[PDB]
Amino acid sequence: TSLVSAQRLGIVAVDEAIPLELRSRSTEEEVDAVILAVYRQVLGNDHLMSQERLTSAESLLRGREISVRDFVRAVALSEVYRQKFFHSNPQNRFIELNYKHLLGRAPYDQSEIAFHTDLYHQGGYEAEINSYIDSVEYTENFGDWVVPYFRGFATQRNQKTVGFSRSFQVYRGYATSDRSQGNGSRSRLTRELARNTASPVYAGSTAESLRGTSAGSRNQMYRLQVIQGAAPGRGTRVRRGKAEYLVSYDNLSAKLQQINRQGDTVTMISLA
Amino acid sequence: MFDVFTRVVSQADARGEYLSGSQLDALSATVAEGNKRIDSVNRITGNASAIVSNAARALFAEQPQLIQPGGNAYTSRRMAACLRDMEIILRYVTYATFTGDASVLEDRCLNGLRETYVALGVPGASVAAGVQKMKEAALDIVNDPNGITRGDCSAIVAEIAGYFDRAAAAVA
Amino acid sequence: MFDVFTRVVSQADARGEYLSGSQLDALSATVAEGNKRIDSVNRITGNASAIVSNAARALFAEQPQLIQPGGNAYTSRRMAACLRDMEIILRYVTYATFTGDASVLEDRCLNGLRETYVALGVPGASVAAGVQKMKEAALDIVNDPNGITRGDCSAIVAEIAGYFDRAAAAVA
Amino acid sequence: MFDVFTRVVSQADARGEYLSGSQLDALSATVAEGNKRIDSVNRITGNASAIVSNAARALFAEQPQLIQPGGNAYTSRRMAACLRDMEIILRYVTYATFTGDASVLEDRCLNGLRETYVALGVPGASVAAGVQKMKEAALDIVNDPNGITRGDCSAIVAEIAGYFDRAAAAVA
Amino acid sequence: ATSSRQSDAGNRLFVYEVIGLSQSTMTDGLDYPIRRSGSTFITVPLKRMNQEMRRITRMGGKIVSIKPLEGDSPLPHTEGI
Amino acid sequence: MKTPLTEAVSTADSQGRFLSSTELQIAFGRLRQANAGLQAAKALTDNAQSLVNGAAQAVYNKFPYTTQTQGNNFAADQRGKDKCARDIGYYLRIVTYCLVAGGTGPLDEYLIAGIDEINRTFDLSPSWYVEALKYIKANHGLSGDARDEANSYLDYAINALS
Amino acid sequence: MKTPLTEAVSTADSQGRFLSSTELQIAFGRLRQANAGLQAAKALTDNAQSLVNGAAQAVYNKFPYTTQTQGNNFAADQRGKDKCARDIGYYLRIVTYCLVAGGTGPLDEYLIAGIDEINRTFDLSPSWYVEALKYIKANHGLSGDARDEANSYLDYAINALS
Amino acid sequence: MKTPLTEAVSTADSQGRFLSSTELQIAFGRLRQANAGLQAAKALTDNAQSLVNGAAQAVYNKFPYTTQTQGNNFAADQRGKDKCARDIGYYLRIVTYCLVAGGTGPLDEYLIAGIDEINRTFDLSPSWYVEALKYIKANHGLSGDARDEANSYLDYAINALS
Amino acid sequence: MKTPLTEAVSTADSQGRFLSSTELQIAFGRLRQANAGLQAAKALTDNAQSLVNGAAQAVYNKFPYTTQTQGNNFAADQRGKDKCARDIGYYLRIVTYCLVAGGTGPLDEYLIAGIDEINRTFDLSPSWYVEALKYIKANHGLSGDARDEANSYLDYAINALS
Numbered sequence A: 001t002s003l004v005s006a007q008r009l010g011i012v013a014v015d016e017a018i019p020l021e022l023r024s025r026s027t028e029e030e031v032d033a034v035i036l037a038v039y040r041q042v043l044g045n046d047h048l049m050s051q052e053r054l055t056s057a058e059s060l061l062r063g064r065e066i067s068v069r070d071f072v073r074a075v076a077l078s079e080v081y082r083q084k085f086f087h088s089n090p091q092n093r094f095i096e097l098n099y100k101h102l103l104g105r106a107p108y109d110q111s112e113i114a115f116h117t118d119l120y121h122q123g124g125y126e127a128e129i130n131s132y133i134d135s136v137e138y139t140e141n142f143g144d145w146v147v148p149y150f151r152g153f154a155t156q157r158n159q160k161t162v163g164f165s166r167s168f169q170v171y172r173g174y175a176t177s178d179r180s181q182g183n184g185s186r187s188r189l190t191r192e193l194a195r196n197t198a199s200p201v202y203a204g205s206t207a208e209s210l211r212g213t214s215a216g217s218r219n220q221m222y223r224l225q226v227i228q229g230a231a232p233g234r235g236t237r238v239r240r241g242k243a244e245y246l247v248s249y250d251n252l253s254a255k256l257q258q259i260n261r262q263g264d265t266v267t268m269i270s271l272a
Numbered sequence B, C, D: 001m002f003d004v005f006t007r008v009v010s011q012a013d014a015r016g017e018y019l020s021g022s023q024l025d026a027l028s029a030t031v032a033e034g035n036k037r038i039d040s041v042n043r044i045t046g047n048a049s050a051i052v053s054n055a056a057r058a059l060f061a062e063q064p065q066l067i068q069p070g071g072n073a074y075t076s077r078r079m080a081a082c083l084r085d086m087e088i089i090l091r092y093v094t095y096a097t098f099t100g101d102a103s104v105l106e107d108r109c110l111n112g113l114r115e116t117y118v119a120l121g122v123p124g125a126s127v128a129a130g131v132q133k134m135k136e137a138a139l140d141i142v143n144d145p146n147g148i149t150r151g152d153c154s155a156i157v158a159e160i161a162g163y164f165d166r167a168a169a170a171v172a
Numbered sequence E: 001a002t003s004s005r006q007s008d009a010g011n012r013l014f015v016y017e018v019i020g021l022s023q024s025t026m027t028d029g030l031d032y033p034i035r036r037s038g039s040t041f042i043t044v045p046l047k048r049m050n051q052e053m054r055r056i057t058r059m060g061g062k063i064v065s066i067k068p069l070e071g072d073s074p075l076p077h078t079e080g081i
Numbered sequence F, G, H, I: 001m002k003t004p005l006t007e008a009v010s011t012a013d014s015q016g017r018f019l020s021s022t023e024l025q026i027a028f029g030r031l032r033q034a035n036a037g038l039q040a041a042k043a044l045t046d047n048a049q050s051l052v053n054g055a056a057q058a059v060y061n062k063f064p065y066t067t068q069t070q071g072n073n074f075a076a077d078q079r080g081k082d083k084c085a086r087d088i089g090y091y092l093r094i095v096t097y098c099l100v101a102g103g104t105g106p107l108d109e110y111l112i113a114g115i116d117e118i119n120r121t122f123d124l125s126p127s128w129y130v131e132a133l134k135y136i137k138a139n140h141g142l143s144g145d146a147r148d149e150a151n152s153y154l155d156y157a158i159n160a161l162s
């Protein structure tokens, strides 16, 4: 995207990112840069120690025996990827992680998730990982020699418009990763991917709201995406099923009590 | 995604019985309207670039703040993306006209377009105005009786207009 | 992921203290019951398809609303999804029995499964009823006295029932 | 790939009969050799870094033209790759010792290593000499008299020496 | 799309030699420039052979020779050195 | 769910271009097939109960062990017979949906995908459904374009099961 | 290239499946459009030299600066007019090729893909070719089924250049 | 070819590290179970012909329709009975291979992978092979650690076919 | 953390399949090793303070320059000796955790991964910790399977540091 949009959305560095291509007869610096870019993007900007750095497939690239795609496949098929993204994660989260790392994309629809879940159940993790690298989208986007990169913030030929809004729910920032505490993360897309809708983006400076004199003692606002239903008491007429609440710190516990007493479910709470 | 046949197939399979005779007669009427539908798709496809260029010219004529330095349509990248957005919206309107169902238009183009345009800074009212201008351009080239055999075409024109206000209501 | 040993290791390392004698003795008792644990894992693995098919037959016998067109388990694709969900839940219950800790079953299978079933429209109550009847069948085949040496097995049966109960409770 | 069991399994399936009595007796003989095999694997794994370092040191002592400014093992990068290659050869010989069949050693490490070394300009004779030095260190640490219960362990030592001999023959 | 996968024998490696990789409406989809069209050597396992053949075929590449390796390692490729 | 209009729009979106005369030709073929498809779906709708009962009876005639041997997967009792009649009604109903739609997309989304673990899990032999679909071949009474369009969907489910 | 038969086979290969009745409907639409496309291509072949000369004259009338201003990209000399007639001959021949094929495949393979580098590198204004294709739209002489197929390709290259 | 030694080496190769004591314990379990696997394979080799003939007779008893109904997939003739005996011999031989190996790797590489295409293309009901494996599970006569290993491969092929 | 049970579950989960006899043998070897490993961890827990103090003293004997030469990374003052005793206590505690878990997973996920950056950044020589682990190999006082499993963990951290 352009400068004014990406400055608000915090995706400036993704837009000024050049796809690294390992040309033939490349210098050791170029092979090292390709290996580092693969470890940053395929392993999701994790702090990768040298004890799990996969020296064999690194030498196979240095050797030019495998292509960049092979290296990406080798990295995604390794136990570093299994420990970081597969074993402690649920299937929805793991499929989203595969899309973000291997294809540089958010998933578009629920039948893609169903296809990848069915392929996992029919052929194992290795088969599932291969699905992404040996896809038409990977070959077209990166092919054999280009390091994969995030393409969800740009206009793609076969892409869904909801993919751009879901890319912010998948890509949290430049100085972020896909590791959580205990290495078990829940998916942020299961509410919308199953229902074929979108959420507001609210990424970085987009999430902010005007405070004024309404912010309370702490000059900060809290942003609540809540799915609202009809109250059993029917005291107040509910006008929309999905509702936005901007509430202060001094009323945040009270507002959570209000939403919980109304039976409404909280889907998102952020700063504003 | 669905078309006019697979949509009725979808809720017939959801309620789990065969299609009624009224549904088959309605689909036969859709098949009868199909030649007019293909004519409408052909003419909007044939004048798509003229529609996009004229609608962009008019939209940035009565909204001069968008092309103005600092505006959303200012800079070659943002203007190229805006003309591309108009072309894609027209493309998915032709897709939904072709299928007879707005499943492709809602599911792959209009889903998340309001949230995308809020995130980017794209004014949805201006895009809705451009989509409206594309609606009168497409309905004037569809309802042009020159170079085509005459007939009643109010149903396909109403369907194209419904897809166009569907596109206009999904950005603002 | 964690098993019965590495959960103890992680809990000790968070405090940074060596293992006590009684906690090592509890691990030794776990090692002594490990043979019975492997036997129960082997029995549920060898009767996995029978357990899944019989519990599916019972579940769709008592709940015809999943059978009728429009039901979540209607359509070969969705019924295959229900069957793989049953084999998946049985597989992760056997993994949790094998490890001695429910870390793989909670983190890998049941994490976000309730909101997934809510968002897809999967009735989690019916899946929980299927999990309960898989529990009843699997505890029948584990507690079968034929073809095995005699012994008290109430601890590993209670552990398997706990994994099945936390599988049914994390779904509905 | 194959181990001591699945190689006989694959040969018996390719000939299409059951395993004979002599094949099961030889497999039982390797089962009796298994504890010796696990001890050999454990010792080689426990002293692998010392084996690689001492063999590389003696290799560069005997052939100083390798680490000379302009030699193949000159420049941290290439020397580090040479130490890495020593680790890969020793690791796959340890794998072949563990399985009881060398199929992992050729099919994952030795197939095409000679053509790779003559493509890179790597002198395969020096690599074979380093593999010989690793072999000598490995059979001195496996056949160490003290620190383990005594036994006639000549068969596993001869099999390890055969693995190192085919590792040296596949680079020279 | 194969029964070879989830098998040790499906890790048998081969080398495809393909020629004639050029831009075409089938190649118009690609987002990256292709730099060589003379003789491209790709190492492919047995399980992945169906995918590779279709991919090479879809782009219009012509397969000239497929060399077996009798190994899981891509070491006898020796083309990029 | 594939259909001439739907995959025409899907592939035109795959190259990301407007609907050229290729897709218009696809829609013209859909229009010339669709009247015969709707007539075939109507005829199968009126004859559906007799066709399903006759197909179930033909399966019971060629496979009498289904009506004799005890088992959950067999039609020896009334429960298995209602399950078999419901299955044949499903096969005929998604065949009529394919005649309405103009492609094998309803078979793909509703019937073909996952039917192999359906048959493996519940011990159902696919040859029973093959014989039922061949009865629907032999006794639907259509002629002309409606017969050949219906027989495409029948034989597609035949080739998936066998 | 973009042709209903080749796109149908490419789609069925993309799902890796046999040709269902959907592809048969695609070929039915190709067959019913193909005779009209062939007679349209025959009429354009028979009127090709007159149409090319008239389109060149229409461009020289609407854009007279290409006739008097000196330059390699202009038609000031006989060489520039020969290149302009050759360009319009290529345009008309590819339009006949698209009429024969039944899709914009010849336009994509031969003309549409890469024409932007032609117009930028050799300083050719695309509006000249757009007005030439408007002349071909105005005076090809076809009627009904034939002209709507030919105007699809003429508008396809007009919308690509603009 | 999954096997404790082969998965130990494949996994440690996937991390690319030397064989820690985890792999040594994998080998210790393999070596303690390997003896019982070897006499289980020896006993099944000794009883192979009787087990294959009894399993074929048990399949023909539970499924008599294979013996009177004609067809390629059925065992009405001597060719079908020879094919069924060869199939059951293949199943028992690969179970002995799994007993020798110590895992379901021989079953995975030789029998389990692609068996759905066998049972679908050649119209072979997998319940026949399931009941053959149940006869081998009921009349092999092993005990102790040998029977627990041998039944585990028999139910695994049963679980794969059902 | 890697462990025979966790790696068995991880391999079966990545294969998407139930626990066959291979993983059961892996657990059998874990059960064979586990009592000796737990008793070895108990003995090292009982002798931990003597082993840590003796290892710090042995490092001060073989590397005396850490005791006289001033610096943040050395043990010249009481703070450096306390940090060295803390480091050796960490090494022995993670060794006891490896003996409890029955694999090098506590060493990998607690100590081995990233230790080169700690040694390079804080200017700690890995030879000091190697000599401390050699002292622990010298005087842990275990016998049989207890000393074999412990010295594997001791050498695993030795090979990772050297």
Ligand SMILES: *[C@H](C)[C@H]1/C(=C/c2[nH]c(/C=C3N=C(/C=C4\NC(=O)C(CC)=C4C)C(C)=C\3CCC(=O)O)c(CCC(=O)O)c2C)NC(=O)[C@@H]1C
Binding pocket: A045, A046, A047, A048, A174, A175, A176, A177, A179, A181
């Ligand atoms: C050190 C003074 C404190 C500390 C740090 C600590 N950080 C992490 C993990 C991560 N840190 C980052 C940050 C970045 N990654 C980047 O690429 C960039 C440049 C844009 C930044 C700023 C990230 C992404 C991670 C997670 C991924 C990874 O580990 O690589 C940890 C690890 C936490 C864990 O449990 O795994 C730690 C410990 N911790 C402290 O106590 C100090 C106050």
Ligand SMILES: *[C@H](C)[C@H]1/C(=C/c2[nH]c(/C=C3N=C(/C=C4\NC(=O)C(CC)=C4C)C(C)=C\3CCC(=O)O)c(CCC(=O)O)c2C)NC(=O)[C@@H]1C
Binding pocket: B057, B060, B067, B073, B074, B075, B076, B079
């Ligand atoms: C002048 C040399 C000749 C000329 C020019 C002319 N230009 C336009 C229209 C547009 N020009 C631009 C260019 C830019 N917009 C940008 O944001 C930037 C970067 C800062 C550039 C370079 C754009 C976007 C338009 C269209 C949108 C708009 O109207 O602003 C026109 C009008 C075209 C129309 O159809 O309305 C004209 C006439 N015309 C000449 O004859 C000169 C020789």
Ligand SMILES: *[C@H](C)[C@H]1/C(=C/c2[nH]c(/C=C3N=C(/C=C4\NC(=O)C(CC)=C4C)C(C)=C\3CCC(=O)O)c(CCC(=O)O)c2C)NC(=O)[C@@H]1C
Binding pocket: C057, C060, C067, C073, C074, C075, C076, C079, F056, F059, F060, F063, F066, F067, F072, F073, F074, F075, F076, F080, F081, F083, F084, F085, F087, F088, F090, F091, F110, F111, F118, F122, F124, F128, F129, F132
């Ligand atoms: C009839 C030809 C023979 C027969 C049939 C029989 N079928 C079942 C059970 C099931 N059949 C299906 C099939 C479908 N479900 C679908 O949603 C669709 C697409 C719309 C199809 C084709 C399914 C899912 C089941 C199982 C779930 C259920 O019970 O509904 C049975 C019962 C098996 C059991 O164990 O309970 C039977 C008996 N049996 C015969 O003998 C005939 C020759």
Ligand SMILES: *[C@H](C)[C@H]1/C(=C/c2[nH]c(/C=C3N=C(/C=C4\NC(=O)C(CC)=C4C)C(C)=C\3CCC(=O)O)c(CCC(=O)O)c2C)NC(=O)[C@@H]1C
Binding pocket: A090, A091, A092, A110, A113, A114, A115, A117, A118, A120, A121, C066, C071, C072, C073, C078, C079, C081, C082, C083, C085, C086, C088, C108, C109, C110, C113, C116, C120, C122, C123, C124, C125, C126, C127, C128, C130
């Ligand atoms: C059967 C008892 C019930 C039932 C099930 C049902 N489930 C789904 C869909 C999904 N189930 C999962 C769960 C998992 N897949 C995995 O791989 C793992 C870990 C290995 C888990 C925990 C997922 C992720 C999905 C979505 C992906 C997919 O669709 O396959 C459905 C499909 C619903 C739909 O049509 O979208 C169904 C029907 N349904 C019932 O009615 C029974 C109570």
Ligand SMILES: *[C@H](C)[C@H]1/C(=C/c2[nH]c(/C=C3N=C(/C=C4\NC(=O)C(CC)=C4C)C(C)=C\3CCC(=O)O)c(CCC(=O)O)c2C)NC(=O)[C@@H]1C
Binding pocket: D057, D060, D067, D073, D074, D075, D076, D079
């Ligand atoms: C000097 C400050 C201290 C010292 C040094 C010492 N170094 C080595 C051995 C090696 N040094 C290198 C370094 C390089 N090799 C390169 O190609 C390059 C880039 C051009 C560098 C920087 C290497 C590779 C070795 C080992 C191979 C070899 O012997 O050449 C030793 C010998 C170690 C041994 O075990 O044989 C020594 C002693 N030692 C000191 O005490 C000084 C304080």
Ligand SMILES: CCC1=C(C)/C(=C/C2=NC(=C\c3[nH]c(/C=C4\NC(=O)[C@H](C)[C@H]4CC)c(C)c3CCC(=O)O)/C(CCC(=O)O)=C2C)NC1=O
Binding pocket: A055, A056, A057, A058, A059, A060, A061, A062, A063, A064, D059, D066, D072, D073, D074, D078, D079, D081, D082, D083, D085, D086, D088, D089, D108, D109, D113, D116, D120, D122, D123, D124, D125, D126, D127, D130, E073
């Ligand atoms: C599958 C397991 C595997 C193997 C077996 C392997 C071997 C291997 N060794 C290589 C290089 C190398 N190997 C050496 C080794 C040496 N030079 C000497 O003089 C000594 C005789 C010897 C060490 C004793 C050197 C110097 C290079 C670098 C060649 C160069 O870059 O010029 C390369 C080229 C890529 C790289 O530089 O890392 C490969 C692929 N890589 C793998 O992944």
Ligand SMILES: CCC1=C(C)/C(=C/C2=NC(=C\c3[nH]c(/C=C4\NC(=O)[C@H](C)[C@H]4CC)c(C)c3CCC(=O)O)/C(CCC(=O)O)=C2C)NC1=O
Binding pocket: A001, A002, A003, A004, A005, A006, A153, A154, A155, A156, A159, A160, A161, A162, A164, B066, B071, B072, B073, B077, B078, B079, B081, B082, B083, B085, B086, B088, B089, B108, B109, B110, B113, B116, B120, B122, B123, B126, B127, B130
């Ligand atoms: C599913 C099909 C599809 C749609 C619908 C789509 C929309 C879309 N429009 C975008 C941008 C944009 N769209 C516009 C459009 C306009 N600005 C204006 O002032 C006008 C009112 C208007 C034109 C009429 C602009 C200016 C941008 C760029 C914003 C920026 O980078 O700063 C972007 C951001 C990524 C990019 O720049 O490519 C997307 C994804 N993309 C798609 O793939």
Ligand SMILES: CCC1=C(C)/C(=C/C2=NC(=C\c3[nH]c(/C=C4\NC(=O)[C@H](C)[C@H]4CC)c(C)c3CCC(=O)O)/C(CCC(=O)O)=C2C)NC1=O
Binding pocket: B032, B033, B034, B035, B036, B038, B039, B040, B042, B043, B141, B142, B143, B144, B145, B146, B148, B149, B150, B151, B152, B153, F021, F024, F025, G033, G144, G145, G146, G148, G149, G152
């Ligand atoms: C591949 C390119 C191609 C196309 C697109 C095409 C369309 C097409 N449109 C038709 C009819 C028609 N088209 C229209 C359309 C209209 N009538 C009007 O006065 C309105 C201005 C307008 C609505 C936009 C009508 C009314 C008919 C006759 C009714 C019908 O056939 O459905 C016919 C029937 C044959 C004929 O009478 O001309 C065809 C074949 N044929 C081709 O070969």
Ligand SMILES: CCC1=C(C)/C(=C/C2=NC(=C\c3[nH]c(/C=C4\NC(=O)[C@H](C)[C@H]4CC)c(C)c3CCC(=O)O)/C(CCC(=O)O)=C2C)NC1=O
Binding pocket: C032, C033, C034, C035, C036, C038, C039, C040, C042, C043, C142, C143, C144, C145, C146, C148, C149, C150, C151, C152, C153, H033, H036, H144, H145, H146, H148, H149, H152, I021, I024, I025
């Ligand atoms: C690789 C396949 C394989 C397996 C799975 C296996 C399991 C196995 N289970 C055992 C014991 C046992 N298994 C049980 C289990 C039970 N007792 C009961 O009455 C309950 C019905 C049931 C709980 C499900 C008991 C009580 C023991 C003896 C106590 C013990 O050894 O832990 C033993 C000890 C040897 C013996 O006495 O038989 C083994 C080896 N051995 C193998 O080779």
Ligand SMILES: CCC1=C(C)/C(=C/C2=NC(=C\c3[nH]c(/C=C4\NC(=O)[C@H](C)[C@H]4CC)c(C)c3CCC(=O)O)/C(CCC(=O)O)=C2C)NC1=O
Binding pocket: D032, D035, D036, D038, D039, D040, D042, D142, D143, D144, D145, D148, D149, D150, D151, D152, D153, H021, H024, H025, I033, I144, I145, I146, I148, I149, I152
């Ligand atoms: C998990 C780590 C671990 C390992 C690796 C292990 C190995 C191991 N090696 C053994 C025996 C043995 N190991 C050897 C080996 C040798 N004898 C020699 O003099 C040669 C120098 C050398 C060949 C390298 C012999 C001869 C035996 C006794 C015979 C046998 O048990 O097979 C035994 C039997 C118990 C004993 O007597 O010590 C075990 C358990 N136990 C463990 O807990």
